[PDB]
Symmetry: C2
Subunit: 98 residues, 2 copies
């Protein structure tokens, strides 16, 4: 019906948006990060669906949860976990920031 | 800037609805944003605003964002604080108004 999710915050909050290309083995993954204060969201443009995950607490790196996925970055690397196919969360897909 | 805008394919209908909860004596407004399988929840808590995303669960609708888990079932909800209560055993209970 409409091309957009709009989330309105206090007008004083600066919002940044940046798209980053990742390479997962031979495959490209486009991820967009939306940052507003402590709020951080990642739009993952996956093969069959688009997921919007939220940054959640972790010991290290920046971890995001959305739908059946965990997306977890550290440095120039990232791991994509699929909790349906791999509920053990031990066999993730590795990606490198371009 | 005041607003997060996330672009999606043009035929995706995005619905936005806010729901008032009461957690004991305290008010809590949650706005839900749904678009396809994407479900986000802005929680305007007492001292902070967070955005959680719907994540897989066995029952009800579970959302995770920041240090919180927000889990609705029917007319009720629980708010988990993984800092104050990492054990995840003392959630705050809320009812939809």
């Amino acid at each position: 019906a409409m091309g957009e999710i709009t989330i309105k915050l206090p007008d004083s909050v600066k919002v940044s948006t940046n798209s980053i290309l990742y390479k997962c083995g031979a495959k490209d993954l486009s991820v967009t990060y939306y940052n507003a204060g402590d709020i951080s969201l990642a739009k993952l443009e996956l093969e069959d669906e688009t997921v919007v995950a939220s940054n959640v607490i972790s010991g290290s790196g920046a971890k995001y949860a959305g739908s059946v996925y965990i997306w977890w970055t550290k440095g120039k690397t990232a791991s994509l976990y699929n909790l349906i196919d791999n509920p053990e969360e031990d066999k993730p897909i590795s990606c490198v920031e371009q």
